[PDB]
Structure formats: C-alpha cells, structure tokens
Amino acid sequence: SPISTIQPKANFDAQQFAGTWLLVAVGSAARAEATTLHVAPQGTAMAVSTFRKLDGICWQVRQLYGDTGVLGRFLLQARGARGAVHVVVAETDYQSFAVLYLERAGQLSVKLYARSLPVSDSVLSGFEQRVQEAHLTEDQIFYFPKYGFCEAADQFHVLDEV
Predict the structure, then answer these.
(1) Structural domain that includes position 21
(2) Which of 39, 140, 143, 156 is the most exposed place for a label (fewest CB within 10 A)?
(3) Taking a C-beta distance cutoff of 8 angstroms, is the pair 97, 113 a contact?
(4) Minimal CA–CA distance to 143: which of 129, 126, 128?
(5) How far is CA 10 from the centre of its chain?
(6) DSSP label at 38?
(7) What CATH code is carried by the domain that includes residue 86?
(8) 57 CA to centre of own chain
(9) SS3 for 130?
(10) CA distances from 109 to 25, 102, 147 (A)
C-alpha cells in the first residue's frame, strides 16, 4: 500500500477544492486526451465528473469519491469488474494547483491538476520531484494537451458510475 505512505492535504477543505480542474500531467507505470474535472462537495464525499474529448465528441463520467474517515483521502469503490481506486489529495493551494495520488491494485500514480494554464514552473518542478519520489521515471510522465478540453456532454455520452 504505497498510497498509505502519502500524507493528505492538512485540513483538506472540499468547499475550496470544488469547481473546475484541468489535467496537466500524469505519472504512472500503467502500460483523445485533454481532461477536465468538475468537483462538487456532497457533505463529506465529493461528486466528481470527468470530461474527455475523443475524436471531437465530449464524454462525461460521473463518479463519487467516498469519504474514508481521513480528510483528503477518498475511495472510488470497486464496481464488480473495476478494482477499487484509492485517491489522495496531497499538495494544493486550492487556487491554482493540486497534486493527487491514485492507487489501484497496489499500483501508485500521481496526477497534477491546475485551475488554469499555464502552471507555474515551481509547481511543475514540484510535481516532477514527487513523481521520482514515487519511484517513477521521467519516461513514465505523461503531459496532456493544453488544448482539446471539454466540459459538457449530451445525454448520449454520459456514463454514471454512481
């Protein structure tokens, strides 16, 4: 459980974390992009919508980040075939960036989100420093497009995992 060694944002505040986040980069060993997150607090848990533009069409996936009893630590419960996904919001100033850790089947990934572009060089370097500390190489870092985002899908392109 590599993600259990990660400290969540102290006194994580869902209210300040709410809103829109843009995916900047992902560090993962896991073997059409431009992603956007819409976060809305639901008491203790967080309702999370993910939007991705594929071949011009915007798709939306509605999920629920369940409260795990530790502020800043969430759980995307397993969905039969889909293994459970542990989520941790580590570093974040709520106003410009967020570094999140995800774990599935014991495999840790690190994601960098921003409120708007461009992201500061300091945050980018910080993220890179966190990626190597998670035992991931520079070649396991994937930077997403700064163009191609979308944040609205019609009823025919919405997947509800809630």
Answers:
(1) 1-162
(2) 156
(3) yes
(4) 128
(5) 18
(6) E
(7) 2.40.128.20
(8) 21
(9) helix
(10) 11, 5, 23
Nearest alpha carbon to residue 82 among 2, 15, 161: 161
CA distances from 152 to 51, 52, 60, 129, 159 (A): 7, 9, 7, 33, 13
CA 138 to the chain's CA centroid = 19
Provide Rg for the chain, Cα atoms.
15
How is residue 19 written in tokens? Answer: 């809103």
Longest dimension (CA), the chain: 41
Residues 6+ apart with CB under 8 A from 159: 59, 60, 61, 62
User: According to DSSP H, which parts of the chain are helical?
Assistant: 14-17, 121-133
Tokens of 104: 């599935």
The resolution in Å comes to 2.0
Query: Looking at the 3D structure of the chain, how many domains does it have?
Result: 1
DSSP 71: T
DSSP state of 6: S
